[PDB]
Amino acid sequence: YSSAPLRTVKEVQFGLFSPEEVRAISVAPRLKCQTCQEECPGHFGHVGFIAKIKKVCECVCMHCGKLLCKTKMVCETRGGCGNTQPTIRKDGLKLVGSWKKDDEPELRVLSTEEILNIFKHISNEVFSRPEWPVPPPPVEHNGAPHHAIEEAESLLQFHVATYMPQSEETRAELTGALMRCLFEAGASAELDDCRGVSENVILGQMAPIGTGAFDVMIDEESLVKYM
């Protein structure tokens, strides 16, 4: 038994975790459960956006984070740095930028740190940002040449990608991200009103179809007159 109010899910607001929230949500046997001594839902602890990341990088300058779009190859210094934006291509699980000279073009790999820094410089503000949790049981320091670090980072990225009638009621009786199916919904902070049959079926609540398209209230005006 729980003392909290019993409610129904009226909206599902998809979004994306912030690094702060993942650390805040995390409780760490801590995932009888050592955290609640219970009924236990499961306590958290602490690849699909590569195309989106590439598009964002092409659509914005990669030095000042100011909107330029993909075809543009110059910052158009309006506030700007004037650097010529590279042509970004997706190779494996990495992004490679190429600069054309003013004679093969210069090429280098845009480090994930560089991409993150630029994204943080870019001007949903609450639920899903471009810059942006271990499932619970129920579900460089020294030396390290650049080659070794790059190989380790590639292996870690590859591993991450791979990892990712019993009642009288029934007796008598006898367009939303969730409805379509989710990554896109989280990126755009899509709000699902849960007005469709699919959403209610997923959440296990009475659907607004047939006997559920209305509400049965209780009237006291008739009750007093019935005695």
Partner: protein, 171 residues
Amino acid sequence: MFFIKDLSLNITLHPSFFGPRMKQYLKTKLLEEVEGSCTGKFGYILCVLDYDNIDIQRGRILPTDGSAEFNVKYRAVVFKPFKGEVVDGTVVSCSQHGFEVQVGPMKVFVTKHLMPQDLTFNAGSNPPSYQSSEDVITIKSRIRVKIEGCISQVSSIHAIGSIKEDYLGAI
């Protein structure tokens, strides 16, 4: 501190009460469920004012439960403790860790670290009491306390008191 607060509640009536006098049962449920209850958001809901004017909106029948949910609006006096507030009360329990001061429906706990260094615990006196050169604090002794912190749970409120500041302690 005492307040007069306009509150709302969601009462549920079993189908056994779906009679011509269901409103009377709602008033009884409101009194028997709210009065004396400790809502951490609003404090100790003490008494309900205007007992003959509670607003009872149309009830809603739950799909499978069969009961009717009523949204009830009422006026009640609620006691809400705030940190940094000064209160008076009568000590009810004394122990080595500290003593408890009863303020209305709330109990305030004063730890050793929150007491002046002069006061010293002593179990020799029956019942055990805190003795100091100027006075002795024990059960039934009036004490003026300052709430240094409150932990308002969903249905429980606890506070820690201090008597070290000036113009506090025994009256």
